[PDB]
């Protein structure tokens, strides 16, 4: 079954229409990946489905409420060290807790994506989990998401991360979302055709 549906969803800001006539579906455990040029609503779409931003046109219907939002630059991210399944993530990846401001840039996304995976989520709205990760953590992502509770929607900019960790692709393009199921390697085979 599906969980979230989108129909003719658009968005208006002070460049031009970013986004128009958007028809897509989230399902029961799909691994959906956003690809698209940066600045093309790659993560504005995530704030539309989160209801973090109110869309100008189009109807966004959802069923299950839990929306885990893991964005880029959450900018003195909180230290509510609660619900200790987070600390399993915070200790596989080898990251200490002690500070936030003196940490390197490499540790802070691994300490934000940590809190995001384990609040409670049947639906992940995460921006870019593949920035400043080493391969022992990049490989740990795919074993998370394969062994995961529900649907994941990510904005990767990686041909590497989507050969393993994708079922659908919601490619953003010339102001229009188009979805394709199955892989990313055969996706460009589909587009060129």
């Amino acid at each position: 079954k599906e969980i979230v549906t989108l129909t003719n969803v658009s968005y208006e800001v002070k460049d031009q229409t970013v986004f128009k006539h958007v028809n897509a579906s989230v399902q029961q455990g799909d691994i959906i990946g956003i690809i698209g040029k940066n600045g093309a609503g790659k993560s504005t779409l995530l704030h539309l489905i989160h209801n973090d931003l109110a869309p100008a046109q189009g109807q966004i219907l959802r069923k299950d409420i839990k929306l885990a939002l893991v964005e880029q630059e959450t900018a003195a991210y909180s230290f509510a060290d609660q619900t200790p399944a987070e600390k399993k993530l915070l200790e596989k990846w080898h990251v200490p807790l002690r500070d936030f401001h003196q940490l390197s840039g490499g540790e802070k996304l691994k300490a934000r994506l940590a809190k995001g995976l384990s609040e409670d989520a049947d639906l992940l709205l995460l921006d870019q989990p593949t920035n400043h990760l080493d391969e022992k953590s990049l490989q740990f992502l795919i074993q998370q998401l394969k062994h995961y509770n529900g649907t994941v929607i990510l904005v990767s900019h990686d041909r590497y991360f989507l050969d393993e960790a994708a079922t659908k692709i919601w490619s953003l393009e010339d102001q229009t979302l188009i979805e394709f199921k199955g892989n990313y390697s055969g996706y460009m085979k589909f587009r060129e055709k």
Binding site: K37, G39, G106, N131, L133, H157
Partner: protein, 100 residues
Amino acid sequence: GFTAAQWTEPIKHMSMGERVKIKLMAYILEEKDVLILDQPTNHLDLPSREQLEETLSQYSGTLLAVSHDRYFLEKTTNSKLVISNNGIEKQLAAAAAAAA
């Protein structure tokens, strides 16, 4: 180099998948003759990091390219600094298993 008619947006009301690009333009417009790239290739795009993968090979030297990618550095590496236990390891090759 990826902008629309966006000559005046506030530069972190921008997109934030730009603003790496703003830094990048401000460097490469002016021939600064020394660069250090503390992790460039992660916010960029598959058409954006590719041309930076390409032109930095044709760059005229003195580059310090930190990159957690394994495939970006295959175009921008001659020598390596493998930071490890008890400080640096200045490598000039793979330098594993202590060549005998």
